[PDB]
Amino acid sequence: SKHLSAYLDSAVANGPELIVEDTGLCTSFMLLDNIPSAHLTKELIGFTWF
Amino acid sequence: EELFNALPQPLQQLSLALAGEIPLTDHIFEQAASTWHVQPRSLTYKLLDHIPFSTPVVVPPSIYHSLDWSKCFAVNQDRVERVPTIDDPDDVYVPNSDIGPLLTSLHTIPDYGFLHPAIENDATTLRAERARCASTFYKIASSQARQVKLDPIRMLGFLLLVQARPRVPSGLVTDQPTRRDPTQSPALHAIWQVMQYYKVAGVYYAPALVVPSGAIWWIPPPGKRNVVSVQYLLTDLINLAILAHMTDMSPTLELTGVLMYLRAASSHSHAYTLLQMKSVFPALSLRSMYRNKGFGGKAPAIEWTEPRSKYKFRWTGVTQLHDGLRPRSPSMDVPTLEVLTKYELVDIGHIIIRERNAHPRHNHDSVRFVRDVMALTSGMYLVRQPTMSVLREYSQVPDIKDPIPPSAWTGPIGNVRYLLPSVQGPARHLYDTWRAAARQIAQDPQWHDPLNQAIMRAQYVTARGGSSASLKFALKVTGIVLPEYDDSKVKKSSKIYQAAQIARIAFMLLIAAIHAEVTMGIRNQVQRRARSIMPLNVIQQAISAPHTLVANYINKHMNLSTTSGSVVTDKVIPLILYASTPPNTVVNVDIKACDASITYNYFLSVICGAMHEGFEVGNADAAFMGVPSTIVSDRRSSVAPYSRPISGLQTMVQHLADLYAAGFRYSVSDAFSSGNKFSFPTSTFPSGSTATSTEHTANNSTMMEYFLNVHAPSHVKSASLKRILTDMTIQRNYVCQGDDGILLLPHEAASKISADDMNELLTCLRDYGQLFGWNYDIDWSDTAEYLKLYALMGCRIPNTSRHPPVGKEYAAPQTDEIWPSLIDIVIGHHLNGVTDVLNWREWLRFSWAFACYSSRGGYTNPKGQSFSAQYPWWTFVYLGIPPILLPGQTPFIHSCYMPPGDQGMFSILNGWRDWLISHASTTLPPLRHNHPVWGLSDVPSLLSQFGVYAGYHAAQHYRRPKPAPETASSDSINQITSDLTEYLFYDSALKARVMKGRYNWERLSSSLSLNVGSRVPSLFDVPGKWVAAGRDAEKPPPSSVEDMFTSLNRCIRRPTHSFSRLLELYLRVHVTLGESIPLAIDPDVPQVAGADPANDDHWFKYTCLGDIPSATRNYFGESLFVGRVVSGLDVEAVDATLLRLKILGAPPEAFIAVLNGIGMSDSEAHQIAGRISLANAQLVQIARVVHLSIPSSWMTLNTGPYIHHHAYDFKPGITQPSAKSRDKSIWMSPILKLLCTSYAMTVAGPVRTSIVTEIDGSAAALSGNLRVWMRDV
RNA sequence: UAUAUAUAUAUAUAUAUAUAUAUAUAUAUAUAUAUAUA
RNA sequence: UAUAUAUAUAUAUAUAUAUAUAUAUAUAUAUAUAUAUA
């Protein structure tokens, strides 16, 4: 009955998922802070700015 | 099994016989029957002590909460009503009360009691209210207990006896032993627990005992009290226990039924509570089966032939099931569960649903499950006070949503008004339809034929009747002195009696009497309110003739009466099967109360006007049925009024409309209530018998047709629905009978209609019916309900609950019957268990036990002697019950389809032949001179030793006493006769015809010396038959009873050693069975639920032959030569005589005399006589000439082709040449084929080819003797 | 005693179905609060 | 007081995911019984 039901009705969906939409940014590479910058508060004040 | 040890010795022997251990014998047959009649019934309950139950059932003490009866009854307007407890006005049934306080003690049995003589006296004499209320309550409560074919305890005893020992296996490879076992049945355990309350010293006092005059009750001690509902609960439990065993259901389902009954019994009004939640089981199971994903299986492929009017169907293979074909309608779980929540029985639904989910695919198991669960509904014949019934049913009037405005009518025509042409709508459609039919009836020389006139007058007389008192009063009122014939001992209320009084009178003198009271009656039902019987008087029945005639024409000439020809009821079987197939969508409809909704203000006025106008085309001066034309005033023109003549038909309408407008005036005289007769009118149509089906079916068809073709397309919204709704017509899409109707949709192309459109369609139909006040009560569940038959996916489902094993209707306070009648009850009881497919082996065992108890009985003179008798068991074999085990054979080799009568005997002997002959030779000395069929071995003495002859002749004896004549009463007999003949022979031509025919006949029969004393059917004897029927309807005097017992005993004791001449000759034939025939259908496909490999024999018989009656060339002999006949005479006697004459080669004038003897004119007599020929006659048509008929049990099988080309009467390579029939084969071969197929159907297992192998005498000798016997009779 | 075959039972793994519990989503009903209208 | 909309809580139904239990089927191991061979 499974095969017969399968062969008789084609409205079983199972279609490939074609429509996929993105509203974000078309990029695949991320700029990454690997090593954080140090916070200076006693000496060398002003050399870095956040 | 210690229970087997508990049984007394004779019953132990009987149980062994039923189990197949030993061949049954008259000796043990009597010992068991005798001892049952002497021991107290309570011992049957005592047997229950020896069953170690292990079921999870608890009987709450809530049962013993008797509600006081005094508040459940009252009298107002001098009638005892029911005053329902709940606000629901329908709680009019027997309450739950303790009957105890109303009991005295009996002198015979001091323990049990009956009503106080003081109470009934005061209610009778003083008309005291409380006395009357108590009496009414006692009467109905007793009556409800009496609704059983016999005492339930006896049935319980039967069940224990058969279930006390497992049956011995046969040698058959399909003989599965029973899977179910005792100690697991919730019903029996429930009976045990509840009965524990009714013991004082281990005595088990029965709560009640049924008697011929009703039922008695046991006086409770001061501590206890007996509620009447308990007795009802026991009956339901016993009935369920029996049914569950026979249907072989799982204990879980039986558990649910027990809880079902217990919950109902706990609350007040046990009947009402059951009635409310009636349809729960079918809705849970039948209405919702395949609403899932894993659907599949095999289904029948049925095709409806092109001339659909003929209702011819063809089996044409099988269809694979798949998900696209699964049912579309919503399930029924939600409403049912919601209802069950009210009675806190949701567990039952959960259990049922969970169990149902185990059958996703359609097969034998699924339908078997459906059959079993649907068998759980209560099988009790509910009864209520007739006064409440009549007050509750006829108090309804239809509500019309758009009445015909008064300005829509013309001026009066004396009584009727014609309908203005400008008016449209369904009413216009109805008006035109009836008018057109009236026109066709108007000119029709079919009437005024004196023979046809005789048919109509004769149709009005039956043994029953009513309203005679009203008749005598009304005519005496108008100065008409009717005759009397009391000395002729016949009931006055019989329709025959009143008819005789009328015979002489000029008809028009009687016209004033039609406006007279009509008595009424009530017949109880199993699953609904009781039905009504409203017999009109003969005069009223005569006046309403035009209404019937037009209705008949509408039916027979539009949709061919939708099967209301009722020729064989089985034509609906293939119809519903086809209607339930996957490719088709079907909807079940039926008028809510067609009898109560047809009325004069809307319906009958339109019909009367149409008929009166429709009869205008015709001779204005033409009397009809003695009603002459008259002058009536026409007032259609306000400027030119006048008067003109109108034909008799119109005069009938004039009075008929007057009567309908006045409304029927009934008079109730219920006996169960006390001194409360009264009369009140109503618009409710009589609808007491099939004579009403014609009118309602006609109107049913008309409204449906207008809805389909006009109203629906103009009103529906879905374009797709419009597309499919069009191209649809009633003649090929709708059938009906009375209120019931079936609507089936055109095959949606490889698809199914949206449930959305269905809802739209069904909704509009409801509104359409609401317009003119018809509640259509439609439903859509992809099943077939028509005339109480159920089909699911082309498989028939026997609703066994509608045939309760223990229940039987009784409409009077007294059973009013004599002991021998019980036998016929047993026979009818057994057949239902065959029609419905039960476990054929176990059902047979139970049947014999029932027979054994019934086999014995007695009677006592009103003052004098007692009398007694009992039958040898072989009687029941002749009556149509297969034997379980013969000496020398193996048990359970005879199928239930074994034919009754001589055929069954012959088949049994034919199989039993060789063993008997050989055994007789060893045991007994040879007889003194050679025998035709036997050798010298003398088996007849052996048969007498088995008492076969005793049983064979005992079954032939009559079972109802005969009333005695008298000579002055014979002057009334002559007076009765004369008048009946006078009523029959209104004209003179018929009398001349019959007299000439009779005179010629006896002259020919004697002179030609065919024979003398031939009782040939003739009209002169029809009044004699009526008189005998009328006298028979009376309660016989005791002397007749004494004659019966004495005659029966003498017939038993008389030593005879011969069967009937026919059976003697039939034994000369030797028949053998070959291989199995080719199969009809795939064994996988189920066709009848329960006819499965488990229930092998039914499964074999159906599979081999196929169910669908498909006589493509046989027509089963329905083409009788005499289409038109008068009542009283038998067509089956007439054609038998005619064929017998034709075989005897009588001269043509013999046929002429016989035909003229039943009113046929000479010209048509010659025309009919010429048609008689051995060629065109059918196998059954010619075989019936020697009373070889088809058993009713076969009517559901396609036996035609088998009898045609599978029962070889002469196979060249097998038959001995001595058996060659030669030229007489033209009429010999059908007889042999009938004998062959009867033997083949007798044995169990698959159907095999049947072959005549030898006739001991030459076939010529057999034919010669047959011709002699044919000439003799 | 060993080997093979068949049947039954137990244990483990895989798959399907049903039931129960927990979480998420949707729908319906009930209760509470807010807003609008009558 | 009623109706409509929104939010929160509770109950019921349906779907998805996870866990537990039961039943069925398949595979592997062990035990018992029966049959055959040594």
Tell me the DSSP string of B1125-1194.
--SSS-HHHHHHHHHHHHHHT--HHHHHHHHHTTT--HHHHHHHHHH--TTTS-HHHHHGGGT----GGG
Q: What is the DSSP string of B385-410?
A: -HHHHHHHHTT-----SSPPPGGGEE
Residue B1029 burial (C-beta neighbours within 10 Å; 0-12, 13-18, 19+): middle
What count of other Cβ atoms lies within 10 Å of the Cβ of residue B1139?
23
Q: How far apart are CA B547 and CA B653, in angstroms?
A: 9
Q: Which long-range contacts (CB under 8 A, 24 or more apart) does B504-510 make?
A: B504/B979, B504/B982, B505/B480, B506/B626, B507/B625, B507/B626, B507/B627, B508/B626, B508/B627, B508/B628, B509/B478, B509/B480, B510/B475, B510/B480, B510/B539
**A9 to chain B, minimum CA–CA distance in Å?**
8
What's the CA dihedral at B1105, B1106, B1111, B1112 to 10 degrees? -110
Give the contacts of B1271 (CB within 8 A, at least 6 positions apart).
B1010, B1011, B1144
Residue B293: nearest nucleotide (C-alpha to C1'): C17
What count of other Cβ atoms lies within 10 Å of the Cβ of residue A11?
5
* B699 within 8 A of B685, measured Cβ to Cβ: no
* B40 within 8 A of B111, measured Cβ to Cβ: no
* B896 within 8 A of B830, measured Cβ to Cβ: no
Q: Give, in Å, how far the C1' of D6 lies from the CA of A23.
A: 30
- Candidates B202, B205, B238; CA nearest to B224 is B205
- Candidates B753, B343, B704, B674; CA nearest to B554 is B704
Q: How far apart are CA B368 and CA B364, in angstroms?
A: 6
**B297 to chain A, minimum CA–CA distance in Å?**
8
Write the DSSP symbol of residue B1221.
Answer: -
Query: E-strand spans in B406-500?
Result: 409-412, 417-419
Name beta bridge partners: B1003.
none
Give the contacts of B746 (CB within 8 A, at least 6 positions apart).
B724, B727, B728, B733
* B1106 within 8 A of B1247, measured Cβ to Cβ: no
* B247 within 8 A of B371, measured Cβ to Cβ: yes
Q: Kindly list the distances between the CA atom of residue B848 and the CA atoms of B179, B845, B883, B1001, B1037, in Å, as whole numbers in the listed order.
A: 22, 5, 9, 48, 32
Q: Which phi and psi (to 5°) does residue B1130 adopt?
A: -110, 125
Q: Which residue has the tokens 């001349």?
A: B992
* B65 within 8 A of B224, measured Cβ to Cβ: no
Q: How far apart are CA B394 and CA B687, in angstroms?
A: 12
* B793 within 8 A of B581, measured Cβ to Cβ: yes
Q: Which phi and psi (to 5°) does residue B962 adopt?
A: -110, 135
Q: Kindly list the distances between the CA atom of residue B1044 and the CA atoms of A17, B854, B862, B1143, in Å, as whole numbers in the listed order.
A: 91, 17, 16, 39
Q: How far apart are CA B627 and CA B527, in angstroms?
A: 45
Q: How far apart are CA A27 and CA A29, in angstroms?
A: 6
Pairing of strands B586-590, B313-321: unpaired
Q: How far apart are CA B646 and CA B620, in angstroms?
A: 5
What count of other Cβ atoms lies within 10 Å of the Cβ of residue B565?
12
Measured over the CA atoms of residue B115, residue B121, residue B127 and residue B130, the dihedral's sign is negative
Q: How far apart are CA B219 and CA B104, in angstroms?
A: 8
Residue B353: nearest nucleotide (C-alpha to C1'): C18
Q: How far apart are CA B1065 and CA B1261, in angstroms?
A: 10
Q: Kindly list the distances between the CA atom of residue B1239 and the CA atoms of B699, B887, B897, B1168, B1207, in Å, as whole numbers in the listed order.
A: 48, 19, 10, 36, 11
Half-sphere exposure of B930 (CA within 13 A, CB side): 3
Residue B294: nearest nucleotide (C-alpha to C1'): C17
Residues in chain B: 1273
Name beta bridge partners: B320.
B298
Measured over the CA atoms of residue B742, residue B745, residue B751 and residue B755, the dihedral's sign is negative
B326: nearest CA partner in chain A: A5
- Candidates B486, B511, B512; CA nearest to B497 is B486
Size of interface A-B (CB pairs under 8 A): 20
Residues of chain B in Cβ contact (below 8 Å) with chain A? 294-297, 320-324, 361
Q: What is the DSSP string of B139-180?
A: HHHHHHHT-BSS-HHHHHHHHHHHHTSPPPP-S-TT-PPPS-
- Cα distance from N-terminal residue to C-terminal residue, chain A: 69
Method: cryo-EM
Q: Kindly list the distances between the CA atom of residue B1054 and the CA atoms of B1051, B1063, B1064, in Å, as whole numbers in the listed order.
A: 5, 20, 19
Write the DSSP symbol of residue B296.
Answer: -
Q: How far apart are CA B1097 and CA B704, in angstroms?
A: 44
Q: Which phi and psi (to 5°) does residue B74 adopt?
A: -160, 160
**A14 to chain B, minimum CA–CA distance in Å?**
17
Resolution, given in Å to one decimal, reads: 3.3
Q: Which residue has the tokens 């226990």?
A: B241
* B629 within 8 A of B648, measured Cβ to Cβ: yes
Write the DSSP symbol of residue B779.
Answer: B
Residue B510 burial (C-beta neighbours within 10 Å; 0-12, 13-18, 19+): buried
Q: Kindly list the distances between the CA atom of residue B1013 and the CA atoms of B241, B1001, B1008, B1129, B1273, in Å, as whole numbers in the listed order.
A: 55, 11, 14, 18, 9
* B234 within 8 A of B191, measured Cβ to Cβ: yes
Half-sphere exposure of B141 (CA within 13 A, CB side): 32
Inter-chain touch B296–A5, beta carbons under 8 Å: yes
Q: How far apart are CA B991 and CA B1197, in angstroms?
A: 44
What count of other Cβ atoms lies within 10 Å of the Cβ of residue B956?
11
- B357: Cβ under 7 Å from strand C? yes
Chain A residues in contact with B323 (beta carbon < 8 A): 1, 5, 9
Write the DSSP symbol of residue B733.
Answer: T
Q: Name the helix (H) or strand (E) containing B1075.
A: strand B1069-1076
Q: Which residue has the tokens 């597309």?
A: B723
Q: How far apart are CA B3 and CA B49, in angstroms?
A: 9
Give the three-state DSSP class for B1256.
coil
Q: How far apart are CA B784 and CA B544, in angstroms?
A: 35
Q: How far apart are CA B1029 and CA B757, in angstroms?
A: 57
Q: How far apart are CA B762 and CA B1148, in angstroms?
A: 62
> Tokens for B499?
């008819």
Residue B243 burial (C-beta neighbours within 10 Å; 0-12, 13-18, 19+): buried
B298: nearest CA partner in chain A: A1
* B1149 within 8 A of B1004, measured Cβ to Cβ: yes
Chain B residues in contact with A1 (beta carbon < 8 A): 294-297, 320-323, 361
Q: Percentage helix, strand, coil, to 5, in chain A?
A: 15, 0, 85
- Candidates B1151, B1135, B1173, B1169; CA nearest to B1008 is B1151
- Which candidate from B295, B297, B322 shows the least CB-CB separation from A8? B322
* B29 within 8 A of B227, measured Cβ to Cβ: no
Q: Name the helix (H) or strand (E) containing B428.
A: helix B426-442
Per-residue buried b or exposed e for B896-924, using 16+ beta carbons within 10 Å of the residue's own CB: bbbbbbbbbbbbbbbbbbeebbeebbeee
Per-residue buried b or exposed e for B680-703, using 16+ beta carbons within 10 Å of the residue's own CB: eebbbbbbbeebbbbbbbbbbbbb
Give the three-state DSSP class for B619.
coil
**B395 to chain A, minimum CA–CA distance in Å?**
54
* B23 within 8 A of B861, measured Cβ to Cβ: no
- Cα distance from N-terminal residue to C-terminal residue, chain B: 57
- Candidates B502, B452, B625, B503; CA nearest to B983 is B503
Give the contacts of B568 (CB within 8 A, at least 6 positions apart).
B1109, B1116, B1118, B1195
Inter-chain touch A1–B361, beta carbons under 8 Å: yes
Can you state the angle between helices B1148-1156 and B1131-1144, rounded to 10 degrees?
Answer: 170
Can you state the angle between helices B545-556 and B648-662, rounded to 10 degrees?
Answer: 100
Chain C: nucleotides below 7 Å from protein CB are: 18-19
3-state SS of B485-501 is: CCCCCCCCCCHHHHHHH
User: What Rg value do the Cα atoms of chain A yield, rounded?
Assistant: 29
Residue B354: nearest nucleotide (C-alpha to C1'): C18
The type of residue at B1033 is A
The type of residue at B472 is K
The type of residue at B153 is I
3-state SS of B537-590 is: CHHHHHHCHHHHHHHHHHHHCCHHHHHCCCCCHHHHHHHHHHHCCCCCCEEEEE
- B354: Cβ under 7 Å from strand C? yes
- Candidates B658, B153, B97, B662; CA nearest to B414 is B658
Q: Which residue has the tokens 């009906």?
A: B736
Q: How far apart are CA B512 and CA B477, in angstroms?
A: 10
What count of other Cβ atoms lies within 10 Å of the Cβ of residue B314?
15
Per-residue buried b or exposed e for B1078-1091, using 16+ beta carbons within 10 Å of the residue's own CB: eebbebebbbbbbb
> Tokens for B718?
């879905």
Inter-chain touch A1–B324, beta carbons under 8 Å: no
Write the DSSP symbol of residue B732.
Answer: G
Q: Kindly list the distances between the CA atom of residue B169 and the CA atoms of B25, B177, B882, B890, in Å, as whole numbers in the listed order.
A: 21, 7, 17, 10
- Candidates B1149, B807, B812; CA nearest to B1000 is B1149
Q: How far apart are CA B216 and CA B110, in angstroms?
A: 12
Q: Which long-range contacts (CB under 8 A, 24 or more apart) does B906-911 make?
A: B906/B1063, B906/B1066, B906/B1067, B906/B1235, B906/B1238, B906/B1239, B907/B1238, B907/B1239, B907/B1241, B907/B1242, B908/B877, B908/B883, B908/B1242, B909/B1067, B910/B1067, B910/B1069, B910/B1070, B910/B1071, B910/B1239, B911/B1239, B911/B1242, B911/B1243
> Angle at Cα B164 formed by Cα B161 and Cα B169, nearest 5°?
110
Q: How far apart are CA B1236 and CA B899, in angstroms?
A: 12
The type of residue at B603 is F
Q: What is the largest CA-CA distance in chain A?
A: 82
| Chain centroid, CA B99 distance in Å | 35
Q: How far apart are CA B317 and CA B326, in angstroms?
A: 19
Residue B597 burial (C-beta neighbours within 10 Å; 0-12, 13-18, 19+): buried
Q: What is the largest CA-CA distance in chain B?
A: 107
Residues of chain A in Cβ contact (below 8 Å) with chain B? 1, 4-5, 8-9
* B591 within 8 A of B597, measured Cβ to Cβ: yes
Per-residue buried b or exposed e for B149-188, using 16+ beta carbons within 10 Å of the residue's own CB: bbbbbbbbbbbbbbbbbebeebeeeeeeeeebebeebbbb
Select the residue from B322, B366, B751 to test the A interface by mutation, using most A Cβ atoms within 10 A. Answer: B322
Select the residue from B295, B323, B363, B366 to test the A interface by mutation, using most A Cβ atoms within 10 A. Answer: B323
Write the DSSP symbol of residue B837.
Answer: T
Q: How far apart are CA B37 and CA B35, in angstroms?
A: 5
Residue B1268 burial (C-beta neighbours within 10 Å; 0-12, 13-18, 19+): exposed
Q: How far apart are CA B571 and CA B561, in angstroms?
A: 13
* B1043 within 8 A of B953, measured Cβ to Cβ: no
Q: How far apart are CA B1018 and CA B1025, in angstroms?
A: 11
* B693 within 8 A of B735, measured Cβ to Cβ: no
Q: Which residue has the tokens 């088998």?
A: B1202
Pairing of strands B531-533, B586-590: unpaired
